[PDB]
Write a protein that binds this DNA or RNA. Structure first.
Ligand SMILES: [Mg+2]
Ligand SMILES: [Mg+2]
Ligand SMILES: [Mg+2]
Ligand SMILES: [Mg+2]
Ligand SMILES: [Mg+2]
Ligand SMILES: [Zn+2]
Lengths: 137, 143, 191, 172, 52
RNA sequence: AGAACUGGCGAUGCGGGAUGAACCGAACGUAGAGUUAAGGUGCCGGAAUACACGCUCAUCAGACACCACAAAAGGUGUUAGUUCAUCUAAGCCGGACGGUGGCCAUGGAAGUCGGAAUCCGCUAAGGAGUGUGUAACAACUCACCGGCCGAAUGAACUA
RNA sequence: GCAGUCAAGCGUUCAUAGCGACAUUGCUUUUUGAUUCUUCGAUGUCGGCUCUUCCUAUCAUACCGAAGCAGAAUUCGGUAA
């Protein structure tokens, strides 16, 4: 080669407008936005849409997502909502594998015993048509 | 104070601009212990020379943006260490009296101040030969 | 106190290409190519353009941060070594028994071989490091000159040559014999 | 000494026929319950006026809630404390969302760095610092810069089970 | 014998040094503290002594 | 070794302190269920490889009352703090010098053996040659030197 | 018995190369005391001989750093049993 090549770790940044997924507590499961950085360990977040109450949180009970939207720092709940909506944040999240697997895993867990049975029967059907394929080319 | 002292340099310098009409900026980069200085008493019926600490010297300039803006053209020659001959005339003879003090190998001038101009200095008026034969030399070339 | 970010800068000159992947740095220029493993320090590189690469520590304490500049330097000397190159010069210094110095080889090896040091019957040998090349000045008496792309390897090979002549059991202020580093600089760009 | 609440304590000397209506004094006290707060009120009053709680009374005790419990502020904290070998005044800064949140980290910090337990510290003053860059202390200024962002390298996820069928990564 | 300038060269190595007063380390001539842990990084240094 | 008050041991198991007369908890018929104390909860071992903010790296770390020791004194290790001073009129790279070997002494004696003062002063640098070389020339080279410089900086301290 | 801290002094000059007063912090348990816990229905004294092992506050030997180390000789100090 002849360009200088340097691959640089592309970390999710703690930053105003960074959107995070809450691991623990009562807002466990929901999305909130970082509004203002408090220190290397704490931030102010706010999840008006998911109804998670604007609060100081410890970064360790949150997980940074790849999504981020434009939000002035310090923005109060009202304007957090306006902006989150403008940005179509839930749209983007829903579209991710990450959000999809959570949904998948949620749906599995709600399956009835009868339902578990049907999935078996259907799987056995798919299997069948697959093994004959995987045998032809 | 030391911002009094910073200001102090500012105070006097402005005053010296406003006390002379000409100014020779003579370079005083390098050169040091006893010699020249003691000739300067003798030459202080013509000038004030002032040696001083550079960032201070520069900030004096900043304070003189208020008026007399032609001193801005001194500014690219502030560099290193330079020193003043506040002055009235000759800038090409008197100057040379000032210059002569005993060389080193020209002690030690490397820049000129000539009221918005920067000569050798060695040419300024001596025969009006750039005003009767060179203010009409393309009037000579074409009538 | 933990510094939230702190960074340094590495100018890449024309003609050289530095490429880094998991802290293994490869630097290539007109003189050659050097590599160096930086895995023992958590620093992160970032290329701004081909003239300029940055290095940061994130959220680091003092001793970590101290590692930053030193990475910059090591990488700087890689770049210099492969453009201007390195050259260290030495001098034999002896009050009486002249120090007799040659290159010799075994198994195509190459050693700096030192004879008669303070009148010693023993022979001293110093392996010549790979990459480093030995000359002998033509017009400075008793000179010896090591050069190459790697300051590390040139400088250590010079150190090896001087350490091998130490003078044991004598007042070393009176008995000053040795081979000492006398100048150090670049291959290209004056001397 | 725990999860802190801040109280107004207001007290006074008991009335005498000679002085009914004696002067009222207030302190803001950080403590975890109100029994501690009134204790603390008397501890300080006794060091400042001739009064023991046997000659005085507490007139009012009221919790003071943070006004803007989600604005982030930078607080100046003033503290007097005892070391193993003397006693010291000390100014520190803390970035937080509430005094009560700040004070609690003050106590942890005095414990971590100077080995000062609670009995050994007096809170002298605690104050929101109005203008940025009246902030004096690097380790809080750092956070005040414009468009501040940082990564969190080397993420360790806690595992729910003892064995794992893949070698984990620290990628954030 | 030995030109003045090489005696000087040799001395940067052999004699322009300072010495730890607790542990005797040969130390850089402008040093403030001993580099050695055994003497507690003492700053009790002295110049190495010059010949006659 | 000897007194004071109380509580203990001795006369007393039990739970904790690995162990242990005297510490901590708690005093005892035979048992069931629940709850705790002092003490603990990586594994030995019943009980969070729990949560939270820091601090610490020891080529001799440290780890819990009674208790199974450590001091004076030091550290440019790292942490947080204090005071003084500089700075919007951290801090960095060069300016630290003449009259007057001033006035007592005495190779010199200057700020620079020693005595008593240190008053004023002014703002710009080529050693009759460092060496090679010549009995001595020629040539090259270097001395009161720095570009300084860019919301902190310098010094002394506390633990 | 052994080792430090301060540094007035010694050391031609020079506190600390080597030393070190007045004071002052310690360490050791092959000195000697102080104590009287065990043993007076028993634990066989001193020295030597013989033999093994351990400590290190190192006398010799290995490699070093200091010096009032020119050389030789020494002395201080480190890693070392
Ligand atoms: Mg109280
Ligand atoms: Mg009281
Ligand atoms: Mg106290
Ligand atoms: Mg108190
Ligand atoms: Mg205790
Ligand atoms: Zn030392």
């Amino acid at each position: 080669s002849t360009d200088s090549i340097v691959k640089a770790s592309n970390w999710r940044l703690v930053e105003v407008g960074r959107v995070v997924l809450i691991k623990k507590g009562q807002s466990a499961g929901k999305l909130a936005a970082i509004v203002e950085i408090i220190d290397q360990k704490k931030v102010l977040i706010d999840g008006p849409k998911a109804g998670v109450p604007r609060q100081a949180i410890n970064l360790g009970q949150v997980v940074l997502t790849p999504l981020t939207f434009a939000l002035p720092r310090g923005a109060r709940t009202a304007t957090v909502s306006k902006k989150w909506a403008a940005a179509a944040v839930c749209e983007k999240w829903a579209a991710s594998s990450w959000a999809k697997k959570i949904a998948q895993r949620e749906r599995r867990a709600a399956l009835t015993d009868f339902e578990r049975f049907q999935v078996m029967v259907l799987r056995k059907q798919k299997r069948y048509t697959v093994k004959k394929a995987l045998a032809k080319a | 104070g030391i911002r009094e002292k910073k200001a102090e340099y500012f105070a006097k310098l402005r005053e010296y601009l406003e006390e002379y009409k000409s100014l020779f900026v003579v370079g005083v980069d390098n050169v040091s212990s006893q010699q020249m200085h003691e000739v300067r008493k003798e030459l202080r019926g013509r000038a004030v020379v002032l040696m001083g600490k550079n960032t201070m010297v520069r900030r004096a300039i900043r304070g003189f943006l208020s008026d007399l803006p032609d001193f801005e053209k001194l500014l690219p020659f502030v560099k290193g260490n330079v020193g003043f001959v506040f002055t009235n005339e000759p800038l090409t003879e008197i100057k040379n009296v000032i210059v002569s003090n005993r060389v080193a190998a020209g002690l030690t001038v490397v820049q000129v101040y000539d009221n918005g101009q920067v000569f050798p200095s060695s040419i300024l008026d001596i025969t009006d030969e750039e005003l009767v034969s060179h203010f009409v030399s393309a009037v000579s070339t074409i009538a | 106190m933990k510094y939230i970010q702190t960074e340094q800068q590495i100018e890449v000159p024309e003609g050289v290409t530095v490429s880094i992947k998991s802290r293994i740095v490869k630097v290539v220029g007109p003189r050659g190519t050097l590599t160096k493993n930086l895995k023992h320090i958590d620093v992160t590189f970032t290329k701004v353009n081909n003239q300029l690469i940055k290095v940061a520590v994130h959220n680091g304490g003092r001793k970590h941060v101290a590692a930053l500049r030193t990475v910059k330097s090591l990488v700087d000397n890689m770049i210099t070594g492969v453009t201007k190159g390195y050259k260290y010069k030495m001098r034999y210094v002896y009050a009486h028994f002249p120090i007799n110095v040659n290159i010799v080889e075994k198994d195509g090896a190459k050693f700096i071989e030192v004879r008669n040091f303070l009148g010693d019957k023993k022979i001293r040998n110093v392996p010549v490091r790979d990459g480093v090349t030995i000359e002998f000045s033509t017009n400075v008496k008793d000179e010896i000159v090591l050069s190459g792309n790697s300051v590390e390897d040139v400088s250590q090979n010079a150190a090896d040559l001087q350490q091998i002549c130490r003078v044991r059991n004598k007042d070393i202020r009176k008995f000053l014999d040795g081979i000492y580093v006398s100048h150090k600089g670049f291959i290209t760009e004056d001397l | 000494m725990a999860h802190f609440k801040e109280y107004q304590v207001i007290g006074r000397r008991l009335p005498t026929e000679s002085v009914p209506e004696p002067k009222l004094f207030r302190m803001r006290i950080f403590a975890s319950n109100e029994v501690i707060a009134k204790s603390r009120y008397w501890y300080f009053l006794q060091k400042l006026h001739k009064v023991k709680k046997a000659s005085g009374e507490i007139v009012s005790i009221n919790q003071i809630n943070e006004a803007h419990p989600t604005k982030v502020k930078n607080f100046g904290v003033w503290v007097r404390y005892d070391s193993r070998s003397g006693t010291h005044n000390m100014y520190k800064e803390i970035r937080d969302v509430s005094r009560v949140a700040a004070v609690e980290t003050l106590y942890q910090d005095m414990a971590a760095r100077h080995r000062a337990r609670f009995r050994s510290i007096h809170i002298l003053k605690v104050a929101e610092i109005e203008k940025t860059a009246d902030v004096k202390r690097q380790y809080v200024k750092q956070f005040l810069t414009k468009d501040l962002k940082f990564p969190l390298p080397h993420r360790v996820q806690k595992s729910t089970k003892t064995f794992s069928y893949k070698r984990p990564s620290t990628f954030y | 014998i030995i030109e003045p300038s090489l005696k000087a060269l040799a001395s940067k190595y052999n004699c322009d040094k300072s010495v730890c007063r607790k542990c005797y380390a040969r130390l850089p001539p402008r040093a403030t503290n001993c580099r050695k842990r055994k003497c507690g990084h003492t700053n009790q240094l002295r110049p190495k002594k010059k010949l006659k």
